[PDB]
């Protein structure tokens, strides 16, 4: 069979494929990280320090 071949085991063409693929991955990481979570919105809205005052009398 064709895919049963030692030439296709260390094929430099697929290595170029992998190289270009992961270089492009590296180039686009800062866009994959650009998703917003709404957890600090929750922290801002719900974190309420104690607003009661001290009154000895």
């Amino acid at each position: 069979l064709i895919p049963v071949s030692l030439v296709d085991l260390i094929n430099i063409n697929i290595i170029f494929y992998i190289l270009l693929l992961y270089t492009l991955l590296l180039f686009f990481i800062p866009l994959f990280l650009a998703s917003i979570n709404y957890t600090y919105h929750y922290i801002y809205k719900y974190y309420n320090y104690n607003y009661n005052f001290i009154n000895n009398n």
Partner: protein, 52 residues
């Protein structure tokens, strides 16, 4: 799971407890009674000092 889609700030409010009460209570428990009666003298003598 739907914590973000609610407003439960009223279910959980900061308590109105005065921590000073817990402090003064520990102060009286450590002191004796004659010192408590002395403080009435310290206050009274301070009044007469302000009077004179």
């Amino acid at each position: 799971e739907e914590c973000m889609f609610k407003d439960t700030r009223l279910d959980v409010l900061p308590p109105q407890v005065n921590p000073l009460n817990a402090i003064l209570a520990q102060h009286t428990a450590q002191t004796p009674v004659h010192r408590s009666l002395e403080k009435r003298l310290w206050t009274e003598v301070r009044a007469t000092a302000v009077s004179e």
